[model samples]
Target: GHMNDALHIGLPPFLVQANNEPRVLAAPEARMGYVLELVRANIAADGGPFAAAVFERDSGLLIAAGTNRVVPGRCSAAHAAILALSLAQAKLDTHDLSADGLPACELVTSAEPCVMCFGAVIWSGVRSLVCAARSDDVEAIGFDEGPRPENWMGGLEARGITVTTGLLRDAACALLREYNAC
Candidate 1:
């Protein structure tokens, strides 16, 4: 019953339009704050409690944004990171963000990526990751992050992807708590 001829995933038009508006978030904290707002909006939209975006690492030009579509898209792999990265790749016309002629890219998420997102990040070719909440925070809210490596940050750094966690963490944790309580 699981076989499919093709797959399709979508981000909300409102979210996509908002991201497309000409704007730049030049600081990690600012980026996380924006991501938290998107997460809150997605939750209100009846989506999951996560959101992520890709940016030109230096200029802070927004490339693409994504929110969790696990339930709406009916695809387990439809996490925010995956959608954001995939959208960025499609927008930039490259599977690798680090590919030549592209500016360095960074992924800014409302929460630390789960195991699935983590693996996706490595292959997505982002040069840096800025996170708001940690995996433990997600699990504390009863979401299963699925056994991420203990040294997950180190693993990413080993692959040349710099990792920065806890930007606007209290705000993100508060958002998750509210989502869980609902």
Candidate 2:
């Protein structure tokens, strides 16, 4: 099979519609709930139990939503974190979320970033990250997170990225456990 010189990626139609609704989510828990919904849908759809979104930090206006597409997209890098950041970057017309003209942006996810995604977040230029589940939760379901840094939170914090962990964590962990059970 021949592939195109350029790469094109997009969300599933259901997610596209879900992301299209323009709304504000002022509370972190509210935002996590939104992402957790996406994760639930993805799991129901037989995808990975992960989902993420990018939003304006202050206004909480969602910039993009992404579900794990590694299997569906046949691209290993199509994890929710990568897809969300890429989509938001494309939509915002800037590779850097903290570009001079743009408002501060945050990446919210149902699960914490894996080793690959943790590095992605550093390069993504988002000002903050909000996570519902930790690597332990994901690993509890038999998912390998790769060799993540021991001081991952510090790694991000040192780079000027605010890290918020364990928001709605029980809910997120339950989803992963459910995914494993099925």
Candidate 3:
């Protein structure tokens, strides 16, 4: 079982998907695709500051898939990545993920996580990050993604979490552009 561990201030509450059963997906790439699908759903439902998905890396079990709803009426930093990580953190605290590692989770984002999310990712114990769009892509939407201490990528690497980008790129950009327009 994975021994749990960082990291943030005043995370907002989110749905934990009650049933702890993990939904199976085809491959890591397909799992990344699925997060984009959730982003699409968020756009359809008119929900976003952003959209995100969290998965248990080796198992590929979807832990939580959602959009940003953290600021509507609560305390969390409320970004999709942060919200989803909070949900994932709850699961880690309450359960055991076999394969036994300190970081067994992955977070996939429609947009690269903002500075707020960057810390949440580290603290949340995610081993990998799959980003569909760049931080500039998120900034183009006017959310300020905020100032990350320079060379945040290096910090993430130092923490032992690998990052991948351009997974379902076009679709997410389109979705975020629509969001920016709306």
Q: Which of 1 and 3 is the better model by lDDT?
A: 1
TM-score of each: 0.94, 0.95, 0.78
Comparing candidate 2 with candidate 3, which one achieves the higher TM-score? 2
lDDT (Cα, tens digit) per residue for candidate 2, span 116-155: 9999899999999999999889888887789988899999
Across 73-143, the per-residue lDDT of candidate 3 in tens digits comes to: 34346677866776666666643222265447788777887788888888776778888888887777776
Worst 10 residues of 2 by lDDT: 1-10
TM-score, prediction 2: 0.95
TM-score, cand. 1: 0.94
- Alpha-carbon error at 15 in model 3, in Å? 6.9
lDDT of 1 by residue, 72-118 (tens): 77888888899899999988999999998889999999889989999
Regions more than 4 Å wrong, model 1: 1-5
| Ordering by lDDT | 2, 1, 3
lDDT of each: 0.89, 0.89, 0.68
Give the candidates in order of TM-score, highest first. Answer: 2, 1, 3
